[PDB]
């Protein structure tokens, strides 16, 4: 979790680790390493047990005990044979089960798209082929564990056969008392009692070795290193650490205590300026000039902690009840708290009640109002909402609550009707910022993009200021 708390979020998005693999590493591989440290003194106590077994065999029945002990020292090449075969089968087992887990989590979130588009048998056939490759690896594992269990039980009665046949034959005739026979049979059986455990020990060693490989693979990844509260000037920012820079030369200037808006197309740098100003992108060049302090944030995809509704508003703030009333009257969850079975003590999320979709956006921006953090960074709060709730979130909330105590807010919105309300607007085009300033500034120079926004609002008669 210390590797998690400074991890780059580009490592999640560019393949290499998924979130199911990251929680699966905790849920399985630390547990497998823990079972290896449960079974590690068994392998540290095995060879002195078998050598004081064979020297007490040399005391009890003589020199035919070494002929009987030939099969127990013959167990080490067959344990090396099943060691290399169970290692290759465990590695193929782990890679096919990781593909099956990632495909099953990828299927089970998309049940609503998959049954509607009627592709569930096709996806189930793909998971069935991944399960077929897994069952090939596990039938290999089943055969190699079978011959190790048969060898680990079948070497003892072979040792009673070689010893008790070789003593009554004429190699020696020293001791055919029952004392050496029953004492040696108990000596073979307490020699045998490690070997019932030894196969489960060595498959736990190979599960330990690939878990330590994936722990070192997870622990090697890249990490996050005038009233202008944010003054990124001239700085190139990239998603990919060896790719083309997604964000080019940007010269932004956010005014303090003042609303600014970020306008552009889809995929133009529009949340990427927020994650570059956070520092979640790695840097090619340039400089950020903060004030870093704590900045309020709600993302485009809303994220839910599985807790109560009131704990998702507060999010380890103090519970002042009056501003809590102010943010639920600003976000208008007051009609939608009574449709919950409890009030604000309804537990929500993944392991809770399934929400609406607009309500998770409203509770994430209701988390975003309640922080005292003085800089509020907002991805799209009016995407999943209608015109009534975005108008009530525009007359209250932004320009009402946070205009009063003078907190800086930036806004990222595809909806352009609130573009009258500004103090600054950042115009963007394709990873470059286009131009910066206010609306009187924007009809002054960039009249083509001003007329482009004039055409989309259908306010041709109205003056935009």
């Amino acid at each position: 979790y210390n590797k998690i708390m400074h991890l780059s979020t580009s490592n999640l998005s560019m393949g290499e680790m998924t979130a199911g693999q990251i929680c699966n590493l905790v849920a399985i591989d630390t547990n497998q390493l823990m079972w290896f440290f449960f079974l590690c003194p068994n392998l540290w106590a095995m060879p002195v047990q078998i050598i004081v077994g064979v020297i007490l065999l040399y005391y009890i029945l003589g020199v035919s005990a070494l002929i009987g002990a030939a099969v127990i020292i013959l167990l080490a090449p067959v344990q090396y044979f099943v060691a290399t075969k169970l290692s290759q089968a465990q590695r193929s087992t782990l890679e096919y089960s990781n593909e099956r887990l990632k495909q099953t989590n990828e299927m089970l979130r998309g049940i609503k798209l998959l049954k509607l588009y009627a592709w569930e048998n096709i996806f189930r056939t793909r998971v069935e082929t991944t399960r077929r490759k897994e069952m090939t690896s596990l039938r290999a594992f089943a055969i190699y564990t079978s011959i190790s269990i048969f060898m680990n039980t079948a070497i003892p009665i072979a040792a009673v056969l070689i010893t008790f046949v070789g003593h009554v034959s004429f190699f020696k005739e020293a001791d055919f008392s029952p004392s050496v026979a029953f004492a040696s049979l108990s000596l073979f059986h307490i020699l045998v009692t490690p070997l019932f455990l030894l196969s489960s020990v060595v498959r736990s060693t190979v599960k330990a070795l690939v878990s330590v490989q994936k722990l070192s693979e997870f622990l090697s990844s890249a990490e996050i290193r005038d009233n202008c509260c944010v003054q990124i000037m001239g700085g190139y920012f990239t998603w990919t650490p060896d790719g083309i820079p997604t964000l080019s030369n940007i010269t932004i200037r956010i005014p303090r205590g003042q609303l600014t808006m970020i306008v552009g197309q889809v995929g133009c740098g529009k949340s990427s300026l927020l994650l570059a100003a956070l520092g979640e992108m790695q840097k090619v060049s340039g400089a950020v000039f903060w004030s870093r302090g704590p900045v309020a944030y709600a993302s485009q995809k809303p994220w839910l902690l599985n807790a109560t509704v009131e704990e998702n508003i507060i999010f380890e703030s103090p519970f002042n009840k009056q501003r809590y009333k102010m943010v639920i009257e600003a976000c208008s969850l007051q009609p939608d708290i009574d449709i919950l079975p409890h009030g604000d003590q309804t537990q929500i999320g993944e392991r809770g009640i399934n929400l609406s979709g607009g309500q998770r956006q409203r509770i994430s921006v209701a988390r975003a109002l309640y922080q005292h953090a003085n800089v509020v960074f907002l991805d799209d709060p009016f995407s999943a909402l209608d015109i009534h709730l975005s108008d009530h979130l525009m007359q209250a909330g932004i320009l009402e609550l946070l205009r009063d105590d003078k907190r800086t807010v930036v806004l990222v919105t595809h909806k352009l009707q609130y573009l009258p309300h500004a103090d600054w607007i950042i115009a963007m085009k394709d990873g470059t910022i286009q131009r910066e300033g206010t609306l009187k500034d924007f009809q002054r120079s960039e009249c083509q993009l001003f007329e482009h926004w004039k055409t989309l609002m259908n306010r041709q008669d109205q003056e935009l200021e």
Partner: protein, 173 residues
């Protein structure tokens, strides 16, 4: 005596289940036979005729060990095949309100961890359980054979074993 245990034996098959319980009882019974012939042949002191019969029942112990090992892997492989793709074919035909009701991480924790436990952990638990249980009751039967006074002594240790297990199990759960 849960119904999941009966689902486990009935999903295995009567063929492999009969091969398992039959070959496991004959394997522990010929181990009982090899030390009873060790008693009769050490206690005789017809010579080497009592080494010929020792070799020929030791070979039955060898191949009975082999058939117990291949039946415990074939039962683990057939239930690990068969408790997947009846589950997946049932959960893919499930209605949408059940996905709306139940948490997804509960279902996915069954598909990960309980499928991995049904895969890898339990057939080792089956061979160690069957070896330890039939080995302890056959050892209790043969030391019932050498002394009949141990049955009179054995019922106090069995009733305090059941009492300390009944005393422990409500703390353990």
């Amino acid at each position: 005596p849960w119904r999941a245990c009966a689902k486990y034996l009935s999903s295995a098959g009567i063929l492999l289940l009969s091969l398992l319980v039959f070959s496991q009882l004959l394997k522990h019974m010929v181990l009982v036979a090899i030390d009873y012939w060790l008693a009769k042949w050490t206690d005789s002191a017809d010579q080497t005729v009592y080494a010929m019969v020792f070799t020929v029942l030791c070979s039955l112990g060898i191949v009975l060990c082999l058939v117990t090992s291949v039946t415990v892997e074939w039962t683990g492989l057939k239930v690990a095949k068969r408790l997947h793709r009846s589950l997946l074919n049932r959960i893919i035909l499930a209605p949408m309100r059940f996905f709306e009701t139940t948490p997804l991480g509960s279902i996915l924790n069954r598909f990960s961890s309980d499928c991995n436990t049904i895969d890898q952990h339990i057939p080792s638990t089956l061979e160690c359980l069957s070896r330890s249980t039939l080995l302890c009751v056959s050892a209790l039967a043969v030391i019932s054979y050498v002394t009949p006074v141990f049955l009179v002594a054995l019922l106090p240790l069995a009733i305090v074993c059941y009492f300390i297990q009944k005393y422990f199990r409500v703390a353990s759960r």
